[PDB]
Amino acid sequence: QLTVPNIPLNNLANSRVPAMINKMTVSTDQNQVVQFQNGRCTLEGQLLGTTPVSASQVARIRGKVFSKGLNLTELDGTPYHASPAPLGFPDIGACDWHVSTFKVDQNLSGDPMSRLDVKQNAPFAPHLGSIEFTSDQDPTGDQLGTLAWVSPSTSGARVDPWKIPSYGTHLAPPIFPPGFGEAIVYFMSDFPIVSAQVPCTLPQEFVSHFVEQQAPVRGEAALLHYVDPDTHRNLGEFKLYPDGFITCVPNTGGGPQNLPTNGVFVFSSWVSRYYQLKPV
C-alpha cells in the first residue's frame, strides 16, 4: 500500500532550496499555475524535471571553469548531456544567483570559496550545458557549490521565487489547481532573497520515498491525514495526486498556514478524483 514518510513537517527539507520546511501555505491567487522543475516526482516514483533524489543535491551546481563561465557537469562530475539542466540545478527563476563553490580536486589554501554571480540573461543556457558568471574571486577547474542567495535581475525588480528559469528543454509540466475549491499546498522555507519564502510542491524526503517505494497508483487521489504525533488527532485532510502534488480546501480566511508544523502526513485511503475535503 502507498505510504508517505513518517516524519514531521519540521523535519522535512525543501526540494527547491537547501533549507527545512517551516510552514505550509496556499497561493494568494488560488488559481495560480506553477511549473517548478525541482521537487517533481510522480507517486509511482518517476522523477521529473531536474529533480534529484537527495536533499543535499537540491540547488547545487558543478562544472569546469572556462575563462568566464562553467561548462556544466552532473553533481558527481560525470558528463551532462544536453532534461532541462543537470540534476539538482537550481530552478529559482528570473533573478541573479550567487553560488558558493570550491575547487574539488585541489589542495586548498587561503580562502577556498568562490562566489559565482550568475545572471539569467542571454548566455544563461544551462540546457545547452553552459552558464556565465562574474566573480570577485578567481575560480579555476572543477567547481562544486550551492546556491547561497538570490537578488533582482535589474535594479528595482523584485525576486519572485514562484517563477522558473528559461533553460534554453523537456520541462516537467505545469501544475494546475485540480477539481473544485481545492488549493495546492506549498511547503515554504526561509532563504536569503534580496528584494518572502521559497515554495515547493513536495518535501524532498517525499520525493526520495516515492523513488524508493515505486508504489502502484490504485485510485485517482490519495486522501492523507495530517496527524499530531502525540495526541494522534487528525488535524486536517489533504489530497495527494498521482502527478505528485498535494491539495487542501482552505477554510475561508485561513488554511494550512494555521496548522502546527510538527504534524505527520499519513496515508488514509484512495479516493475519487472529486472527493470533497473537510476545510482546514
Ligand X SMILES: CC(=O)N[C@@H]1[C@@H](O)[C@H](O[C@@H]2O[C@H](CO)[C@H](O)[C@H](O)[C@H]2O[C@@H]2O[C@@H](C)[C@@H](O)[C@@H](O)[C@@H]2O)[C@@H](CO)O[C@H]1O
Instruction: Point out which residues bind a copy of itself (CB under 8 A).
Output: 5-7, 10-14, 18-20, 22, 52-58, 75-76, 100, 102, 104-105, 108-110, 112-113, 144, 146, 148-149, 190, 192-195, 204-205, 208, 211-214, 261
Q: Point out which residues pair with 221 in neighbouring strands.
A: 271
Closest CB to a copy of itself among residues 13, 26: 13
Closest CB to a copy of itself among residues 5, 93: 5
Q: Smallest distance, Å, CB 11 to a copy of itself?
A: 4
**What phi, psi does 99 have (nearest 5°)?**
-115, 125
Residue 229 binds what, of ligand X, a copy of itself, none (CB under 5 to 8 Å, by partner type)?
none
The Cα 109–Cα 245 span in angstroms is: 45
Nearest-CB residue for ligand X: 151
Q: Is the dihedral of CA 175, 181, 187, 193 positive or negative?
A: positive
Q: Smallest distance, Å, CB 99 to ligand X?
A: 11
Closest CB to ligand X among residues 96, 243: 96
Q: Point out which residues pair with 145 in neighbouring strands.
A: 61, 101
Where on the chain is the footprint of ligand X (CB under 6 A)?
Answer: 96, 98, 110-111, 117, 151-152, 154-155
C-alpha cell at 141: 577547474
Closest CB to a copy of itself among residues 44, 220: 44
Q: Smallest distance, Å, CB 110 to ligand X?
A: 5
Q: Which residues contact 58 (CB under 8 A, 6 or more apart)?
A: 13, 14, 15, 16, 17, 18, 38, 52, 88, 204
Residue 22 binds what, of a copy of itself, ligand X, none (CB under 5 to 8 Å, by partner type)?
a copy of itself
Torsion angle of the four alpha carbons 164, 168, 172, 174, in this order, in degrees rounded to the nearest 10: 50
Neighbours of 195 (CB within 10 A): 12
Q: Smallest distance, Å, CB 179 to a copy of itself?
A: 30
DSSP of 155-179: TT----TT--------PPPPBPPPT
Q: What is the largest CA-CA distance in the chain?
A: 60
Residue 33 binds what, of a copy of itself, ligand X, none (CB under 5 to 8 Å, by partner type)?
none
Residue 171 binds what, of a copy of itself, ligand X, none (CB under 5 to 8 Å, by partner type)?
none
**What phi, psi does 97 have (nearest 5°)?**
-110, 150
198-200 and 142-151 strand pairing = unpaired
Closest CB to ligand X among residues 150, 184: 150
Residue 96 binds what, of ligand X, a copy of itself, none (CB under 5 to 8 Å, by partner type)?
ligand X
Q: Smallest distance, Å, CB 103 to ligand X?
A: 15
Q: Smallest distance, Å, CB 113 to ligand X?
A: 9
Residue 235 binds what, of a copy of itself, ligand X, none (CB under 5 to 8 Å, by partner type)?
none
The Cα 41–Cα 241 span in angstroms is: 11
Q: Smallest distance, Å, CB 150 to a copy of itself?
A: 9
Neighbours of 228 (CB within 10 A): 15
CA-derived radius of gyration, the chain: 19
